[PDB]
Design a protein around this ligand. Structure first.
Ligand SMILES: *[C@@H]1O[C@H](CO)[C@@H](O[C@@H]2O[C@H](CO)[C@@H](O)[C@H](O)[C@H]2NC(C)=O)[C@H](O)[C@H]1NC(C)=O
Ligand SMILES: *[C@@H]1O[C@H](CO)[C@@H](O[C@@H]2O[C@H](CO)[C@@H](O)[C@H](O)[C@H]2NC(C)=O)[C@H](O)[C@H]1NC(C)=O
Ligand SMILES: *[C@@H]1O[C@H](CO)[C@@H](O)[C@H](O)[C@H]1NC(C)=O
Ligand SMILES: *[C@@H]1O[C@H](CO)[C@@H](O)[C@H](O)[C@H]1NC(C)=O
Ligand SMILES: [Ca+2]
Ligand SMILES: [Ca+2]
Ligand SMILES: [Ca+2]
Ligand SMILES: [Ca+2]
Ligand SMILES: [Ca+2]
Ligand SMILES: [Ca+2]
Ligand SMILES: [Ca+2]
Ligand SMILES: [Ca+2]
Lengths: 278, 430, 90, 407, 332, 90
């Protein structure tokens, strides 16, 4: 299945489990904890803190079985050398659109990252009971061994600090427990009206509603003023829509998070990247 | 130099300028067909005359007619337990083990004499991140047990002791608060390091040669039989030899590990490359030792421990302080190698005393001057810690006052007391 | 007559002995007017989008030092660079 | 008090009842019937193993072995790697002729010389010729063949040259044995009558390894480069002032070398991991493959993997590591056109009848661990005549006088 | 397509192109279409030359891919399924199609594409257009005949962001220390070993390819770059009527008794392929449309108690108990 | 304190791109006192016993150009050279 992070520090494991971890240092996103031989490792590095509303990613570190891929915002580095994309070596495809940077590996790994904040990973069914990252394990059980290990229920803030990576020059402080705010239930009407629109018709049976509307609750009351946190969750709902197989419609109006592209390049959701180019 | 060439001469004869019947040609100097008993020797440079003796490592040699005649001198042997797991036996033979038990490091073979144990347990997360934790000494016909925990805390027979502690058969000192020096009358000397990581250095005389067993080998000159177990035959690997020296029967058996840690960790392997390369480049104060120590094997272990342990700077600074340790053992002392690399404790010395590189046992207080022949214990190595300069010996507490008003040690009285012995500079008028 | 030169890639990070990458304009021109500072395997990126710290001016040429790239990425090596120079002829 | 048959000689410092003790196999065993452990295998009482010339016996949890003195072996292999007769490993990259073994040590009867030339561009050297001086006879091993030079008039110290697998084997009646894989690897063996009576780059063979760095002027030094520079044959040959690093002078060849040479630390050789230490054979293979940068580097590789697999056979673990993609071997080249007799025996262990050994003639060591192609002669002519690589009837083989085959 | 970027078109035009992208080799979507064959050229060395490391075959909606010494089926369509066949003949892998398209691959860098003569003048790509007239094989994607090898080859790249090749490298000039080995090993082709083929195949463009290939395998495994270039020449010699036996245990050895049941000796090295034995396809009428009996490799010589070679397991079987062969899959 | 430097062999005839062999003293010293100009594989020969035409002075260093060695021998290549510099320290 799919692990994913997006928005203002929202996460989603291979078995659901949407939570919110505002850690800023350097983490393990998914890894092969089989024990005998590690096939892959994906290391996430949150930035210095962009602002209150967004939450970027500074760099992604990825090691597949012989070689190390280092992704930043502008360039992609394979084994210390800059690559021109697309890159076609016979176990590894690295290609760069105008929106996403994809990495396709024969080991059953697929990474896809727009270069600000949204990062998603896809693994095949070979790695079951072996993954050990912040994306949980890949057993299929909802919240079983991620949060309730030996009877004690781990909070999502102490589940994330366990997944940290120690770098041998820099001391980075873990984020402390904030005082428990009010459960923002005074904006459930706006998230339910917005996300179940007519454009999301043939995905109400594919992806659920309750996790991605729960994540919409904090994005309305932690991000006041401009709407830049609510349209990274419904932008993630229209990516989970168009990954199971469905096709969403256009929801971005001129007043609901518009996007601009030069020329007469109109923006759409669910259209093919294979363009005939004159 | 190359005598007896003509016994392997696959050439016919021609003309040219030659030697007479005897009178071999001078190669080492520059003269002609000199007699054989005027051949000047050579030894890394200098043109030694035929008869000039020299004092080498463990032997003394005299230049005979072209060849050296060497004769053995007594010299000790040193087993080291560095890092968490890097054993160097008495006869060379460095190996890596990664145990989890008490292990017999050296013990006397007769029935009693002594036994030196040591705990090599995992300290980090995995099993391959091991550390030394406890040194146990069983001395004086194995009725006295001395325990060296990894926080100081020397304790004899489950009871804390105060240092120094000088007895008839052994004595334990503490000169620099991260260094413990133990001397025995049998011929065994210990040096326990406490910071950054715990390490151990053992020294035997050459009278005990071929008369010890443990993880330090048998000390007989050959290093092919150091992996010879106590039941016959030589083992192949270090972890197969060392499972025969478990001091507890309920310990599991350990196995080797054919991996390097600098491939399993990509974030630690650039930090290991940048800082352990200072052992090999000559702009640093480590190129002074390159003529004596040959850092190519310290560089390989420096990368090993740095990529492996969880606190990477404590394994860097321990492996850089072991090249500097084994270079002062051959004369070349590195004054001031801690200025760019491991200086997180240099400036933290107290108000009067400074950071030294040649701190020894007999630079102590004026209470040590009261005995002055009882506890000095020559034969150890100098260590680096906080201490006082060339004068102004240490007082009873705090700063080190000069020699005139030091103390008069009975209780250490101040410099105003009259017995008829007026308290004076060091000595007393008694 | 102020034509640009060609691209000069006469040094590499994984070869040479200058511990980095240095490209100079000797054998072509004496005192240039302008210099262009790009990379080999992705030549539309600026020098601020590589993140490595270099100097690239008309006086001496291009200098990248591998010791300056410590702590920047996980690899710590210079990228492969190339330059043009602009010189005017009578 | 809980003894364990492995902590007998430890001391019991810090389940089974009193009397009985554990054996590491299962239930509690008396002290008399206690087993023995050797290289991670568990041998019960009264078991027999061999160690290189001797025979041992698990008696009472300890080994009781016979005391005979075995032959001693010097090795020269790859890009300047050595193992002395007393087992000291070092590296020396010299470019001259060097004394390997001789007994003209301060009058003498033999000398073996090695000729080391640069193979690569990084400054490392490997051995490309061997000269054997026995009395006044001079052999020379050069260009995949042996050459006789200066055979003396009536003395003629009896030697024998035959080909065993992929290697060429010279033996002498005086106790000197040279084994050569026709490229760079040499094995010298001496009978145990040469104890403490030799010198050279192979040491002095006195079962004590802290004096193997004795120079030509009888001085024990601590440097690999003061010792090795003193055994050069010509005075005008230069001195080696440092050892090169090939994987640092060729950064682009490191990724291939460390991936091909990782067969040794893998599950293919996992039967030998408890019997031979793979770590100095992994480091030799990477040093050898980063430096064959002028041509033919898959020959530098396959020799380094067959130096490790030879020790594994010699210690009791036959490993079959070659595939048609990794270091292939071509043994059906030698067959009569499609009658299939030459088979690849990966660990040599087959004792067939030659036309020497049918007339009593036997060697003094066991060379039945040498990799190569071996015959399996049919049942109408089951006698292998070696100097023509033909299976013959026991009558019509040859003569073998003065080390020459006469039909 | 062979070695470090060497080509021969359907009309017999030899050229060199060292591109680093995906390139159209053959297609009939030429200005609607039924197939496409793509080559994936990556740098092999440090000098800037490239060699072919993957082949993608598009037939209708089926996509094969030849990668890592094996064939992989990708996107098998629902009910159309253009009938193809994959079998292994000697050292090479051979894909055949019912529509007339044949791809032969030595599992490293050498590819042979064959088309039935119904495709005359109806293809394009880096292999030309197959109209028995070779002064128009450098037609670009926009239907323009150019005279440059580098304007033609740069127009058949698949992605627009792939760079342009602006010069061809010289490997024996960028590696002066590898020239003496390369010109001495590759001089077997002009020697007395191949002297039966010297009057039937011109050795001169095969000598120059072998030296170009051996000066540039400078990162590892150069005795594989060599032995492939000497087997490209000896394959033409068999195809023209001259069987040459050039391999020795010191020069490019081959290991064919690996495949034997432990010491029963059936797999022999046939140096020029010419043997016609019974498989379990051809016992049921199934025959190919070309003659692949010139391909070097190890061939069986099955005994007289089971003389039928079942190919998908490399076993000699009795004529009854071989298999099924439905939808290109062996079922026991 | 006017100790000699080491030997500097940082260039080769069969490598590099300067079409010859050039050895300079940068990274060691600024303004030397003396320079020694010898060969690698036979270091007792003077520069007049090699027959090649070079310049080797204290100002710029060592220069050998392969185009200057045409017509001298049958091979026409620079030999492999190495240098010392002499610098005084306070
Ligand atoms: C194996 O070693 C024996 C013992 O030295 C060799 O026997 C010697 O042979 C020579 C002539 O061949 C005689 O002069 C010696 O007297 C023999 N020694 C003894 C003790 O009798 C034997 O030759 C060696 N084997 C081979 C094949 O050479
Ligand atoms: C050899 O070529 C013939 C001629 O095209 C192939 O026969 C075709 O087979 C397909 C299905 O297999 C049919 O749809 C066509 O109608 C056949 N053609 C004719 C003219 O009848 C044959 O399949 C090819 N051989 C192989 C092994 O595929
Ligand atoms: C572990 O086993 C399989 C995969 O190995 C998986 O489907 C299953 O759900 C897992 N079970 C448990 C109890 O973790
Ligand atoms: C240590 O060395 C310093 C040299 O700077 C000098 O004070 C003296 O030789 C030593 N100090 C002692 C022995 O207290
Ligand atoms: Ca779970
Ligand atoms: Ca020993
Ligand atoms: Ca460089
Ligand atoms: Ca460059
Ligand atoms: Ca010895
Ligand atoms: Ca045409
Ligand atoms: Ca040059
Ligand atoms: Ca030079």
């Amino acid at each position: 299945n799919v692990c994913s992070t997006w928005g203002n520090f929202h996460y989603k494991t291979f078995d659901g489990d949407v939570f919110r971890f505002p850690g800023l240092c350097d983490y393990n996103f998914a890894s092969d904890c089989r024990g005998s031989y590690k096939e892959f490792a994906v290391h996430l590095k949150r930035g210095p803190g962009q602002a209150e509303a967004p939450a970027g990613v500074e760099s992604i570190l990825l090691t597949i079985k012989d070689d190390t891929i280092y992704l930043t915002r502008h360039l992609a580095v394979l084994n210390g050398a800059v690559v021109s994309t697309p890159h076609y070596s016979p176990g590894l495809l690295i290609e760069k659109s105008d929106a996403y940077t994809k990495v396709y590996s024969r080991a059953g790994l697929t990474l896809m990252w727009n270069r600000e904040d949204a990062l998603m990973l896809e693994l095949d069914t070979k790695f079951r009971n072996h993954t050990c990252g912040l994306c949980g394990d890949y057993n299929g059980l909802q919240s079983y061994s991620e949060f309730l290990s030996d009877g004690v229920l781990f909070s999502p803030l102490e589940f994330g600090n366990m997944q940290k990576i120690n770098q041998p020059d820099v001391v980075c402080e873990d984020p402390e427990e904030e005082v428990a705010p009010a459960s923002c239930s005074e904006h459930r009407a706006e998230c339910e009206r917005l996300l179940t629109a007519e454009a999301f018709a043939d995905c109400q049976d594919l992806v659920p509603l309750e996790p991605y509307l729960r994540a919409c609750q904090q994005d309305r009351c932690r991000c006041p003023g401009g709407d830049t946190c609510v349209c990274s969750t419904v932008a993630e709902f229209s990516r989970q829509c168009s990954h199971a197989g469905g096709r969403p419609g256009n929801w971005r109006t001129a007043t609901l998070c518009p996007k601009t592209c030069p020329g007469n390049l109109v923006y759409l959701e669910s259209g093919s990247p294979c363009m005939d180019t004159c | 130099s190359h005598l007896e060439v003509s016994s392997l001469c696959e050439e016919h004869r021609m003309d040219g300028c030659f030697c007479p019947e005897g009178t071999v040609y001078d190669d080492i100097g520059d003269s002609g067909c000199v007699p054989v008993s005027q051949c000047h020797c050579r030894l890394h440079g200098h043109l030694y005359t035929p008869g000039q003796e020299i004092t080498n490592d463990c032997e003394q040699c005299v230049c005979n007619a072209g060849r050296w005649v060497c004769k053995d001198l007594p010299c000790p042997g040193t087993c080291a337990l560095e890092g968490g797991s890097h054993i160097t036996t008495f006869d060379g033979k460095t190996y890596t083990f990664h145990g989890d038990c008490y292990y017999v490091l050296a013990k006397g073979d007769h029935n009693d004499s002594y036994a030196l144990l040591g705990e090599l347990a995992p300290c980090g997360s995995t099993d391959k991140q091991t550390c030394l934790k406890t040194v146990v000494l069983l001395a004086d016909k194995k009725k006295n047990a001395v325990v060296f925990k990894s926080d100081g805390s020397v304790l004899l027979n489950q009871l804390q002791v105060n240092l120094p502690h000088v007895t008839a058969s052994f004595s334990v000192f503490r000169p620099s608060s991260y260094h413990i020096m133990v001397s025995m009358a049998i011929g065994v000397r210990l040096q326990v390091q406490l910071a950054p990581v715990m390490q151990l250095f053992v020294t035997l005389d050459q009278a005990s040669q071929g008369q010890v067993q443990g993880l330090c080998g048998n000390f007989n000159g050959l290093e092919g039989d150091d992996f010879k177990t106590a039941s016959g035959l030589v083992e192949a690997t270090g972890a197969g030899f060392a499972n025969t020296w478990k001091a507890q029967s309920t310990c599991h058996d350990k196995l080797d590990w054919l991996d390097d840690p600098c491939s399993l960790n990509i974030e630690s392997a650039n930090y290991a490359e940048h800082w352990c390369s200072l052992l090999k480049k000559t702009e640093t104060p480590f190129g002074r030792c390159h003529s004596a120590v040959d850092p190519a094997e310290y560089y390989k272990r420096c990368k090993y421990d740095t990529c492996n342990c969880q606190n990477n700077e404590d394994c860097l600074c321990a492996a850089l302080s072991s090249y500097a340790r084994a270079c002062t053992a051959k004369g070349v002392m590195l004054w001031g190698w801690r200025e760019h690399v491991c200086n997180k404790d240099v400036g933290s010395c107290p108000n009067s005393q400074v950071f030294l590189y040649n701190l020894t046992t007999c630079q102590q207080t004026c209470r040590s001057l009261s005995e002055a022949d009882s506890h000095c214990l020559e034969g150890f190595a100098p260590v680096d810690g906080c201490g006082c300069p060339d004068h102004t010996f240490l007082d009873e507490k705090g700063r080190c006052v000069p020699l005139a008003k030091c103390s008069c040690y009975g209780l250490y009285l101040e410099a105003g007391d009259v017995v008829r012995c007026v308290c004076r500079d060091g000595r007393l008028h008694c | 007559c102020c034509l640009w030169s060609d691209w000069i890639n006469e040094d590499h990070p994984s070869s040479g002995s200058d511990d980095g990458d240095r490209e100079t304009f000797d054998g072509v021109c004496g005192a240039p007017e302008d210099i262009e500072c790009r990379s080999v395997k992705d030549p539309h990126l600026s020098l601020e989008q590589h993140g490595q710290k270099v100097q690239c001016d008309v006086s001496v040429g291009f200098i990248c030092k591998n010791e300056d790239q410590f702590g920047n990425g996980p690899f710590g090596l210079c990228y492969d660079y190339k330059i043009r120079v602009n010189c005017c002829w009578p | 008090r809980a003894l364990s048959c492995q902590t007998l000689a430890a001391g019991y410092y810090h389940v089974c009842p009193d009397g009985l003790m554990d054996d590491g196999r299962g239930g509690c065993v008396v002290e008399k019937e206690c087993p023995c452990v050797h290289n991670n295998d568990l041998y019960s009482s009264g078991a027999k193993i061999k160690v290189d010339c001797n025979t041992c016996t698990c008696k009472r949890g300890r080994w009781v072995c016979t005391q005979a003195v075995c032959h001693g072996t010097c090795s020269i292999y790859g890009s300047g790697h050595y193992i002395t007769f007393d087992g000291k490993y070092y590296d020396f990259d010299g470019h001259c002729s060097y004394v390997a073994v001789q007994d003209y040590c301060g009058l003498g009867s033999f000398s073996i010389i090695t000729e080391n030339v640069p193979c690569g561009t990084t400054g490392v050297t490997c051995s490309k010729a061997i000269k054997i001086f026995m009395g006044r006879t001079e052999l020379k091993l050069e260009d995949k063949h042996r050459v006789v030079i200066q055979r003396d008039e009536g003395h003629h110290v009896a030697y024998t040259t035959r080909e065993v697998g992929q290697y060429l084997v010279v033996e002498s009646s005086t106790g000197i044995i040279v084994i050569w894989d026709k490229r760079t690897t040499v094995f010298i063996k001496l009978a145990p009558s040469y104890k403490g009576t030799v010198c050279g780059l192979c040491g002095n063979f006195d079962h004590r390894s802290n004096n193997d760095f004795t120079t030509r002027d009888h001085m024990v030094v601590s440097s690999e480069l003061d010792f090795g520079n003193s055994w050069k044959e010509a005075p005008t040959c230069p001195d080696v002032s440092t050892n090169p690093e090939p994987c640092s002078l060729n950064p682009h060849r490191r990724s291939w070398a460390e991936k091909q040479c990782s067969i040794l630390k893998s599950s293919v050789f996992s039967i030998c991991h408890s019997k031979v230490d793979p770590k100095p054979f992994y480091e030799a293979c990477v040093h050898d493959s980063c430096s064959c940068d002028t041509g033919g580097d898959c020959e530098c590789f396959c020799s380094a993997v067959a130096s490790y697999a030879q020790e594994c056979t010699k210690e009791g673990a036959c490993v079959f590591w070659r595939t048609p993609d990794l270091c292939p071997i071509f043994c059906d080249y030698y067959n009569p056109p499609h009658e299939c007799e030459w088979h690849y025996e990966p660990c040599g262990n087959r004792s067939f009848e030659t036309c020497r050994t049918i007339n009593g003639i036997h060697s003094n060591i066991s060379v039945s661990y040498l990799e190569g192609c071996y015959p399996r002669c049919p049942k109408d002519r089951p006698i292998y005549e070696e100097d023509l690589k033909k299976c013959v009837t026991a009558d019509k083989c040859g003569c073998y006088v003065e080390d020459t085959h006469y039909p």
